[PDB]
């Protein structure tokens, strides 16, 4: 069975843990720090030293809108955002990568080789091709 602790028999409260946390709560006051603390508490336990974790990061569009609006800035709540190595609008991909890395750095430290973490973010072809055709046109 798999346990759902988000904030084949599926149950809501064992072989795997499904943990979901909204990624656009950094401005709200913060909640992202609480989520990271809970994740680091569950990952480093000793009773669960062989179970893997599947992580879901939803509400991406709300974060995109919030970062494009510009009313609230990340660095006001997460001072580590500055001096961050470079990897739509260029101010969204950096935010998404930073949010993912905050969770990833906790896992890599300990437990290597006994369990793993799987992070997931939760016609288009014609539009993609038309936009590519427009952008790449070169004047004679």
């Amino acid at each position: 069975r798999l346990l759902l602790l988000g904030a084949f028999h599926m149950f809501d409260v064992v072989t795997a843990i499904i943990y979901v946390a909204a990624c656009s709560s950094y401005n709200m006051v913060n909640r992202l720090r609480e989520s990271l603390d809970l994740f680091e508490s569950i990952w480093n336990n000793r009773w669960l030293r062989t179970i893997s974790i599947i992580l879901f990061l939803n509400k991406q569009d709300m974060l995109a809108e919030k970062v494009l609006a510009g009313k609230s800035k990340i660095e006001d709540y997460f001072p580590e955002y500055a001096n961050y190595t470079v990897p739509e609008d260029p101010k969204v991909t950096r935010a998404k990568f930073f949010i993912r890395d905050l969770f990833l750095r906790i896992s890599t430290a300990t437990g290597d080789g006994k369990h793993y973490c799987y992070p997931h973010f939760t016609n288009d072809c014609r539009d993609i091709i038309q936009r590519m055709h427009l952008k790449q046109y070169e004047l004679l």
């Binding site: 084949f8 028999h9 599926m10 072989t15 795997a16 499904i18 893997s52 599947i54 879901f56 991909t93 998404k96 990568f97 993912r100 793993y116 799987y118 992070p119 997931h120 973010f121 939760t122 288009d124 072809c125 014609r126 993609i128 091709i129 038309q130 590519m132 055709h133 427009l134 046109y137 004047l139 004679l140």
Partner: protein, 457 residues
């Protein structure tokens, strides 16, 4: 600079202009950013040029004037006072109706280039294009070049102008597809570039020792493929029974295109990419001609084109830049082909997911094609991470139990959650009766297996 040129143009001496304008074109040949201190003078020069093309002049003077005007027309601001119907009629008159004369080809080429620049840059020219009926004249010029020689440049730039007009306006696009016979004519152009000699109704004769193509034929083919993509954008919305014969010939021509090489290794990729882009608009029920021959060989069929497509995708994954614009069309085309046909799906399943024999390694680590497609399943982008999962999900007959064997629950959790099934289940489609395909070693190691990770501890 422009003051002396304008004065000597207003003077009117035929010989002096052919030298002054040529020198001006030589000095400015690779400039694309203009400063605002030189605007007014430039504008005046532009008008002066249009004042001299009305009178009769030698051909070299016309060529020089058109070269200078092409350079000036790059900047958007100058065109506003000089976009009028009387001015455009002169360009149309120069471009066009007897092709017997041979020394007047460069004039036609230069006028077509100037029209391309003017139509793309400005906005009123697109509105005048409907009034002047440019598309019908372009198609007539295309038909007039059926058998003549020394015609490649005119055809290439005619196709370029048609592509621009179709891209920037919708009324002209609707005029080409349903009236004016756009689909046959353009198809014929391709059939003339590749030199196809039909063996059967929808089959062509292919020689392995065939000579490579030429740069000019490559350029004509590329322009024709782009224009044909713009014409048939809304084809899949409504399909009748009287259009199948027209689309099957197009599919056969594209299949013949996929089996030849260009001059260099860089043009071949562009040719195949444009062919793959066009193939995504043809209705799915007319794509069987891709495996049309009955003689890689599977079930007594010929499957070289599918192998070429697979190699194309595998080589595109290797470089790690721009996955969104480089992997969506080919993966979508392969999934659509595999959903509706039976031979293609079985061939691809045997080529991508062979029977399992290595159990002491994780799916993500490795260098085979299965490993790359599994690594692609956890990506920040949504389109890539969904299409790469769906491609593997189709090959396994939409059964969860067969997907979890090859990939693992951890990698497939996202796709399972998206489709609403997180437990044992099946897809909506039913393909055929399940069989047994298990290797012996796996049968030994199954009791001690890890379902979440996908390998043996």
């Amino acid at each position: 600079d422009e003051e002396r040129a304008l004065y000597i143009v207003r003077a009117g001496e035929a010989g002096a202009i052919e030298r002054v304008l040529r020198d001006y074109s030589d000095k400015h040949r690779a400039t694309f950013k203009f400063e605002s201190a030189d605007e007014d003078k430039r504008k005046k020069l532009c008008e002066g040029i249009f004042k001299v093309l009305v009178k009769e002049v030698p051909t070299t003077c016309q060529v020089s004037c058109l070269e200078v005007l092409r350079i000036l027309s790059r900047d958007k601001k100058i065109l506003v006072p000089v976009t009028t119907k009387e001015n455009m009629q002169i360009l149309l008159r120069l471009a066009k109706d007897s092709l017997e004369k041979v020394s007047e080809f460069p004039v036609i080429v230069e006028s077509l280039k100037c029209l391309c620049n003017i139509v793309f840059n400005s906005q009123m020219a697109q509105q005048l294009s409907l009034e002047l009926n440019l598309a019908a004249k372009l198609c007539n010029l295309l038909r007039k070049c059926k058998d003549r020689k020394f015609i490649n440049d005119i055809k290439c730039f005619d196709l370029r102008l048609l592509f621009v007009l179709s891209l920037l306006h919708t009324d002209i696009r609707s005029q080409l597809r349903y009236e004016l016979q756009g689909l046959p004519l353009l198809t014929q152009i391709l059939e003339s570039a590749f030199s196809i000699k039909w063996t059967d109704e929808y089959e062509s004769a292919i020689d392995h020792n065939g000579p490579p193509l030429s740069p000019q034929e490559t350029d004509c083919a590329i322009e024709a493929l782009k224009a044909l993509f713009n014409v048939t954008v809304d084809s899949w919305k409504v399909h009748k029974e009287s259009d199948s014969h027209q689309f099957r010939v197009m599919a056969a021509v594209l299949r013949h295109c996929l089996l030849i090489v260009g001059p260099t290794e860089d043009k071949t990729e562009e040719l195949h990419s444009n062919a793959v882009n066009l193939l995504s608009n043809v209705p799915v029920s007319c794509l069987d001609v891709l495996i049309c021959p009955l003689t890689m060989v599977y079930n007594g069929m010929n499957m070289e084109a599918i192998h070429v497509l697979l190699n194309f995708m595998e080589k595109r994954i290797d470089k790690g830049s721009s996955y969104r614009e480089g992997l969506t069309p080919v993966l979508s085309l392969l999934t659509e082909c595999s959903r509706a046909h039976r031979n293609i799906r079985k061939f691809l399943k045997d080529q991508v997911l062979p029977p399992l024999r290595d159990v002491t390694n994780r799916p993500e680590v490795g260098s085979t094609v299965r490993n790359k497609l599994v690594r692609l399943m956890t990506h920040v982008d949504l389109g890539v991470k969904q299409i790469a999962a769906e491609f593997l999900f189709v090959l396994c007959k939409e059964r969860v139990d067969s997907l979890l064997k090859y990939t693992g629950y951890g990698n497939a959790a996202g796709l399972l959650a998206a489709r609403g099934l997180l437990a044992g289940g099946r897809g909506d489609n039913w393909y055929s009766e399940d069989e047994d395909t298990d290797t012996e070693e796996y049968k030994n190691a199954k009791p001690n297996i890890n379902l979440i990770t996908g390998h043996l501890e």
